[PDB]
Amino acid sequence: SVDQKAISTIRLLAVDAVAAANSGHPGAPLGLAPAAHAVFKKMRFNPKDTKWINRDRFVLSNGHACALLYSMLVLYGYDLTVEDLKKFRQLGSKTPGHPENTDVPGAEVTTGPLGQGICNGVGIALAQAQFAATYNKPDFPISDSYTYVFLGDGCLMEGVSSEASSLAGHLQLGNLIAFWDDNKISIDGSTEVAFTEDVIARYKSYGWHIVEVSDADTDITAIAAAIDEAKKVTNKPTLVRLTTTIGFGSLAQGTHGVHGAPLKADDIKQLKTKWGFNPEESFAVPAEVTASYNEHVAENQKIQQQWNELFAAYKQKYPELGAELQRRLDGKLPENWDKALPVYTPADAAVATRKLSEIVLSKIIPEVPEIIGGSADLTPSNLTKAKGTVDFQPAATGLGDYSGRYIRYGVREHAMGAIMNGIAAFGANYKNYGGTFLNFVSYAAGAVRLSALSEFPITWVATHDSIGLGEDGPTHQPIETLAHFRATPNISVWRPADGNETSAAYKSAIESTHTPHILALTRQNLPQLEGSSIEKASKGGYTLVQQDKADIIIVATGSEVSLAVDALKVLEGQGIKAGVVSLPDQLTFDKQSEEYKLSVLPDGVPILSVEVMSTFGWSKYSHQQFGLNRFGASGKAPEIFKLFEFTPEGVAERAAKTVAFYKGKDVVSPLRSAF
Amino acid sequence: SVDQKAISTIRLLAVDAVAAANSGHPGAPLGLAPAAHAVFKKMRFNPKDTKWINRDRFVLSNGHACALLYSMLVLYGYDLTVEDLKKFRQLGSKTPGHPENTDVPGAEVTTGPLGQGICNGVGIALAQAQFAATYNKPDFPISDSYTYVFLGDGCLMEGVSSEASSLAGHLQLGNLIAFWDDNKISIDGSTEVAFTEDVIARYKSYGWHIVEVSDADTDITAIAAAIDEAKKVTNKPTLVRLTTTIGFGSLAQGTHGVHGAPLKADDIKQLKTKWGFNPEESFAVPAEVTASYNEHVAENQKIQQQWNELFAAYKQKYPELGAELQRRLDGKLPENWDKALPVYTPADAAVATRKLSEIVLSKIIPEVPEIIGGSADLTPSNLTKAKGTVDFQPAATGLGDYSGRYIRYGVREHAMGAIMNGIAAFGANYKNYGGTFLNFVSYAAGAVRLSALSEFPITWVATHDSIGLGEDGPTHQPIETLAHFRATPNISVWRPADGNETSAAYKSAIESTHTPHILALTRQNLPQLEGSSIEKASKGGYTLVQQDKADIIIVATGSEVSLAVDALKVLEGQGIKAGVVSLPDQLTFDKQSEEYKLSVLPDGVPILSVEVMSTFGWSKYSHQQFGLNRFGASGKAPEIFKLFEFTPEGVAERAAKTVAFYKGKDVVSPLRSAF
Ligand SMILES: Cc1ncc(C[n+]2c([C@](O)(CO)[C@@H](O)[C@H](O)[C@H](O)COP(=O)(O)O)sc(CCOP(=O)(O)OP(=O)(O)O)c2C)c(N)n1
Ligand SMILES: Cc1ncc(C[n+]2c([C@](O)(CO)[C@@H](O)[C@H](O)[C@H](O)COP(=O)(O)O)sc(CCOP(=O)(O)OP(=O)(O)O)c2C)c(N)n1
Ligand SMILES: [Ca+2]
Ligand SMILES: [Ca+2]
């Protein structure tokens, strides 16, 4: 039949792509081609408009199987061709060895690191539910799309998927339909060696619906019926168990050897001949398959065309919501939204930056509907909920509604990070955030790095940034954390010192379209600074205290800027004149012009950095570094600062030593380099 | 009764400790005091010998509840007193706000970061099973101890605990007995807001046994009976559901407000009077309680005394095993074990450092019985199993035995990291390791940081260290990873360049007693270097190519040392003389004498670093840095190196620019500083 021919075409494209690269993963593509064919025939999508907001989404969580995804995209006429498949895994191609949303048309997210994609799917589904609750009206199903996810045993072993699956079951996300490739093989061999749990019983315990397809190597009727069944269960996410043979059809089917290396040439020949293809030919695309797939595309395009008319009619029937929706689909924030950002003066009271963050959120959430966010069981400590908002919960629970704004992630930092990526991937201008302690952002590193690689504008509200948190002690106090994330490409790491800098950090985080943000915020109170503003802090680094005859410049962040200002006064009594630079975001600073940066960190003067955690990175901006390169301590925070000499006198002593060390030396800006 | 008085004493000590600090967590201590009393009465331990190898172990996974643990330790006469309790959460005390094994007698591991402790308990139990299988004989139960773990809802939400619980169920770890504090309250409020899964059904799906105690606020008979029942189920770990009231007895019992802040003074008064204590008194320890607890200590000490005689008799009956066991309990490796380390010459073939690692393991595993380890589903890629060894599995599976050496962790990096910490915490000189790709060590950051803080000699075999892995692409290629872990205190991060450096890295990792190791290893082949040796590489950094008239020194690691040697030859053709330094471990190097370090990185010569990932940290050792501060690419590895100019010519160009940049300047070693 044509369906059989399509499945064979998909299988053979994937095998031929791996063969051409002499690298990659043929096993899961062979096993999942029937399911991929069946799912894509049920999906609504436009290969010519990858951003249609009411498309169904597909996520390949077992990203190593991406020859399968690329084959589907090529067959359906996305902006990806057979010539791209022939360049699978080759430098600069559109077909990298794991899917990247920045590079691959039709890749909603970046997968490859196991466990992430299913969590991203939870976030796409969460966003769709929130979006639909916000905009849909009687006779106006603006958003009614599904989220389809393929995942394997490896994703099911990764703890992040357990976190997201528990939460998705709690949230009753009925438009999420995941498919487990139950092939009983991972890299080390049979799952009997390490993964003998009853996966189905576990998913039932989370509140998921289950459909089992016992012959997923051939039974596309049952796979399609499983989708229809899942669509009837509107209050539970569904897991479809696809019992498959890894490498189905290969001489080496059912073995770990077919997971991750190219097939032998004679194996590929026998695959072709068994399925009616020419063993001398590679990258065959039977015209019957193209015709069948084109029929489905044409139907989907007519569905989108009708959706566009529904949207036009919605704008007439619901003028206010319709204009808001239009603006969001155009990728624009509300005009002058930033006028809601709080502004402080040096006469205002000292405030912890966690509390300043609460105040920002309480002003901007009412102004910017596409802001949603939550905390990983730290709401009253991170201060991430605006008073008066409703939680995102299924209404059946009585605890919230899908139109709610605030997500109770539970103690699930890693899944929160990956869910945030999915919410961003949904689109519609969502600007979403997640709170935890800075030290526990590290639990989510797998997802955070993917925020950076995927270019998603997600925001971590990362409070309790340092030893300033005090008594909870060294298991809670960051040392390495800023260095880790600053060393990752494409992460803005804001460490605001005061009220105005906190508003600048949020301006950046909400305006972002391609750069994730981490906002490192304090437990302890900090004074409002003389010389700060949103305008200056928006440059990432700025001269706070200008001293034209400086003997030294002190560059600092966050809680250490006030410390530097107090040290400047001690230094004056020692006959040393200092300037102060505040560097709330190193990435934003780095992106300024060379001349602006030199106006902040000029030649001809020693520069000392002060920040109460690792000194890594700081030589970009300073000649000497005063930091904390050991673990912290459990005690009252001011006593910990005194112990480590992060005091006005301790900073002054190191500044004076720095001045002396450079006496008789020629000093050029740390910004200069040989290449 | 005296048991009731003991429970009240524990509760009130914990509340009074929190009150004295005006900081900390009274709720779970109040709820878990009955269970703590019951568990410690069942446990075998010696307060005067915290290292008795056949003790039962206790782990407080909900580490915020540590006022409870400290109260138990004080009551039982560990080296912790009421005076220490009065200094709870105070700088420098023995009673920090979360338990630290380095500081607190009787704290087996460091908890506070949720989810870790239960996983550590899995590792203690894994080690006990392996140890018992290795040493026990008929009439000689050398090891027969249990592992008791308390954990809360937060630990159950963290994905790392799901990973470890799936694995522990697979491994049939019948001497693990965990207790869930089922109090339905976390920081954000009721667990109904975020955590509505059927935990018991989930644990059954992993193959755990369940016992439910419906009134754990009072029913210590049922808690004791649950322990006895768990001990009869020898092939399953047990989860005991303790249904408790958080803050039991408080006016604010059953609320999130009692989780994490001190009780009101009038609340403490009514707690005392209800339980028969003097509301005017704090830190009361009724002598009846001390007497009762001392009886149990005396009995336990007689048990240890008999164990010591069993051990003496074992050494006579099993002379070979007995001597091995003695040596391990003394903390000593086999005499001259390091003679088994492979040694290479520059005439030997190029080898990837993952393969050199395999060869090291295959030589030292037969020589050092206390080495065990595994991989997170990457055994044939990390090359972490010595041929001929047996896997650690329950014999009932037919797949291994508890005497096995090699652990199939599955796709569970975070739990592997925390399990490794538990194996180290067991003691008996275990030197254990875990393989994954370097980029996915990041999934385990929560546990890795605790390896450092806890001072455990665990080892990550972290292959596929760079863009040198090639086609799997940027989701797999580390950039930030070395910087992150090097910026963490107390992590040796070895990046060996060749065969001799790989043997030095293992020498360090196996000899370690207080410092975790990460071995960053290559997929691609590297040449054997002229000038390398175990002796020189053991210094962490050394002069590979000495050039007395150097115009520049190139410092490099791993795969970039050979690149630097090739660049030296290009530079010679340009009239520039270079030296080369190899820096296989920055931490080990930093610990050498100032004079040794200056012999490697002298004054008076520009120094350029070369390493194909982040430049963070490198200014400690260099004036200019050539690194990779952007994500990688999917393609054949040599093409990626060429794209980013990590070629002999690209290094030479930057070296020549560095020489020019310092013409006419006075250059001092990067090792100098102002303070
Ligand atoms: C977070 C995480 N951890 C481990 C992995 C590694 N991994 C993976 C890869 O890195 C690919 O993403 C490797 O396959 C990798 O390409 C090769 O090992 C490279 O070989 P070599 O020639 O360089 O030696 S896949 C994988 C487990 C596969 O188990 P599954 O059951 O999910 O997939 P299956 O049904 O067998 O196809 C596992 C465990 C990952 N992708 N993400
Ligand atoms: C990996 C990880 N993530 C989050 C946490 C945070 N956390 C914790 C702490 O950091 C303590 O370890 C906080 O309590 C912290 O001390 C306060 O929030 C500080 O307050 P503030 O005065 O500074 O505002 S405990 C916790 C959840 C508690 O839920 P559980 O159900 O485990 O404990 P319970 O029965 O309620 O006592 C949670 C979620 C953690 N310890 N580890
Ligand atoms: Ca599989
Ligand atoms: Ca709880």
Cβ-Cβ contacts under 8 Å for A295 (sequence gap 6 or more) = none
- Window 57-86 of A: residues touching B by CB (8 A cutoff) are 63
Q: Do B194 and A90 touch (CB under 8 A)?
A: no
Contacts of B188 in chain A (CB under 8 A): 375, 377-380, 408, 410
CA dist., res. A452 & res. A430, Å (int): 17
DSSP-derived 3-state class of residue A520: strand
Task: Write the DSSP assignment of A99-132 as a string of letters.
Answer: --TTTSTT--S---STTHHHHHHHHHHHHHHHHH
Query: CATH homologous superfamily of domain B1-326?
Result: Thiamin diphosphate (ThDP)-binding fold, Pyr/PP domains (3.40.50.970)
**B chain contacts of residue A187, beta-carbon cutoff 8 Å:** 377-381
Please report the atom of ligand 1 found closest to the CA of residue A63: 12
How far apart CA A406 and CA A399 sit, in angstroms, is: 11
Q: Which residue from A397, A617, A630 is facing B489, i.e. has the nearest CB?
A: A630
Distance from the alpha carbon of residue A406 to the mean position of ligand 1, in angstroms: 35
- On whether any CB of chain B is under 8 Å from the CB of A235, the answer is no
Q: Which of residues 266-285 of B touch A (CB under 8 A)?
A: none
Every domain of chain A with CATH number 3.40.50.970 lies at: 1-326, 327-538
Residues 6+ apart with CB under 8 A from A80: A70, A73, A74, A94, A95, A104, A105, A106
- Among protein residues, the one with the nearest Cα to ligand 2's atom 25 is B64
Closest CA to B82 of B285, B320, B278: B285
Q: Does B377 touch chain A (CB under 8 A)?
A: yes
Token representation of residue A444: 């989510």
Question: Under the phi-then-psi rule, with left for phi > 0, alpha for psi from -120 to 50, and beta for the rest, what region is B333?
Answer: beta
Q: Is B27 in the pocket of ligand 2 (CB under 6 A)?
A: yes
Taking a contact as any Cβ pair under 8 Å apart, which residues of chain A between 503 and 532 contact chain B?
Answer: none
CB A200 within 8 A of CB A241: yes
Residue B149 belongs to what H/E stretch? Answer: strand B147-151
Size of interface A-B (CB pairs under 8 A): 363
Q: How far apart are CA A230 and CA A223, in angstroms?
A: 11
What is the residue-wise DSSP string for B524-535?
SEEPPPTT--HH
**B647: DSSP letter:** S
Question: How far apart (Å, rounded) are the C-alpha atoms in residues B433 and B375?
Answer: 8
CA distance B120 to A143: 45
Please give the distance of CA A396 from its chain centroid, rounded to a whole number: 29
- Is residue A394 exposed (0-12), middle (13-18) or buried (19+ Cβ within 10 Å)? middle
Active site residue B413: yes
State the distance from the centre of ligand 4 to the C-alpha of B651, rounded, in angstroms. 56
Nearest to B183 by CA among B129, B243, B111, B105: B243
Q: Is B286 exposed, middle or buried (0-12, 13-18, 19+ CB in 10 A)?
A: middle
Declared resolution, Å: 1.1
B644 interfacial to chain A (CB closer than 8 Å): no
CB of B579 within 8 A of CB of B541? no
- Own/partner pairs, B363-367, CB within 8 angstroms, 24+ separation: B364/B337, B364/B340, B364/B506, B364/B510, B365/B389, B365/B405, B366/B340, B367/B334, B367/B337, B367/B340
For ligand 1, say whether the CB of A153 is within 6 Å of any of its atoms. Answer: yes
CATH 3.40.50.920 fits B539-675, yes or no: yes
CATH code of the domain made up of B327-538: 3.40.50.970
Rounded to a whole number of angstroms, the distance from the CA of A153 to the nearest CA of chain B is 8
Coil, helix or strand at residue A531 = coil
**Of A387, A282, A227, the residue nearest A17 (C-alpha):** A282
How big is the CA angle at B613 (ends B608 and B614), to the nearest 5 degrees? 80
User: A206–B197: do the CB atoms touch at under 8 Å?
Assistant: yes
Where do the CATH 3.40.50.920 domains begin and end in chain B?
539-675
**From the CB of residue A328, how many other CB atoms can be counted at a distance below 10 Å?**
22
Technique of determination: X-ray
Which tokens in the block code for residue A204?
Answer: 């039932």
**Which of residues 97 through 136 in chain A touch B, CB cutoff 8 A?**
97-98, 100, 110-115
Q: Does B162 touch chain A (CB under 8 A)?
A: yes
> Does the beta carbon of B675 lie under 8 angstroms from any beta carbon of chain A?
yes
Q: Comparing C-alpha atoms, which of B556, B557, B468 is closest to residue B519?
A: B557
How many angstroms separate the Cα of A8 from the Cα of each of A20, A32, A217?
18, 11, 12
Torsions phi, psi for B23 (to 5 deg): -165, 145
Q: In what order do the strands lie in the sheet with B431-437?
A: B406-408, B371-375, B431-437, B459-463, B517-520, B492-494
What sign does the CA torsion over B137, B138, B140, B144 have? positive
Closest ligand by atom to B247 CA = 2
Q: Nearest bound ligand to CA A259?
A: 1
Query: A253 CA to middle of ligand 3, Å?
Result: 12
Cα separation values, B630 from A234, A500, B247, B647, Å: 43, 31, 50, 17
Label residues B579-604 b or e (16+ Cβ within 10 Å = b). Answer: bbbbbbbbbbbeebeeeebeebbbee
Long-range contacts: B90-96, Cβ < 8 Å, 24+?
B90/A634, B90/A635, B90/A636, B90/B21, B91/A633, B91/A634, B91/A635, B91/A636, B91/A639, B91/A640, B91/A643, B92/A633, B92/A635, B93/A634, B93/A635, B95/B17, B95/B66, B95/B70, B96/A473, B96/A474, B96/A633, B96/A634, B96/B66
Q: Dig out the tokens for A182 from the structure.
A: 């139950």
Residues 6+ apart with CB under 8 A from A595: none
A62 within ligand 1 shell (Cβ under 6 A): yes
d(Cα B632, Cα A632) in Å, to the nearest integer? 34
Q: For residues B129 and B135, what is the distance between their CA atoms, to the nearest angstrom?
A: 10
What is the rounded distance in angstroms from the CA atom of residue B481 to the CA atom of residue B358? 23
- Using a CB-CB cut-off of 8 Å, the residues of chain B touching A480 are 449, 484-485, 487-489
Which residues lie below 8 Å from residue B18, measured CB to CB, with a gap of 6+? B24, B25, B26, B29, B67, B88, B262, B263
Who contacts B371 (Cβ-Cβ below 8 Å, separation ≥6)?
B361, B364, B365, B405, B431, B432, B433, B510
Kindly report the number of other CB atoms within 10 A of residue A527's CB atom. Answer: 17
Whether the CB-CB separation of B271 and B15 falls below 8 Å is answered with yes
Centroid of ligand 1 to alpha carbon of A113 (angstroms)? 8
